Design a protein around this nucleic acid. Sequence first.
RNA 1: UCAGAUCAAGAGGUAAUGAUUAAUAGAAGCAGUUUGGGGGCAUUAGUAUUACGACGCGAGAGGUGAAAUUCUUGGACCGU
Length: 127
Amino acid sequence: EIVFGVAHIYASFNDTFVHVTDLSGRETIARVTGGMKVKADRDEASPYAAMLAAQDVAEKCKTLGITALHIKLRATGGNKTKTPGPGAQSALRALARSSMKIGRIEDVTPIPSDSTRRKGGRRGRRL
RNA sequence: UCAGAUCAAGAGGUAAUGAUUAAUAGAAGCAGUUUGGGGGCAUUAGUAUUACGACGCGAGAGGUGAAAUUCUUGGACCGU
């Protein structure tokens, strides 16, 4: 008895996208991100928004009944931060405590063989 | 003839018969073995960032000190 989903945690800064799909990813279930729960624009980064809006997906994957699933952490690095934010794996302790069978955890942010040009301009982010 | 001098000697014979070193200077070579993101021209790969095409999804998303500008004629963001 092993049916499998893919969690696709896009653990960005100032949001968190807990968007489980089917195994091929063409078919999405329960689009719930951390933005659709609290609306104050600056606790969307918080691990508590990734706490509740991750196991919020765990009920709606039991509407179709998928016991086991896989994880895909994303950072959101392209020419950018390349490591997951604050509410990154607080959305992983949310899932495994919510009666799930989690084996696969992978960092599927991709990294370039060199970036085009990033924002900021040679002395970037003064103040 | 001596010819003050001055050109060339019967040249085949008698002279140790004549070219210093090779610079922990340089240069050039090599049956030389290589070595280096050195320069040129072709060839070719890598993910990424876009922009679009399909398809699923459903109301958010960018961003920030807090914001707003901005993106959702929902089909965006996200997943592919």
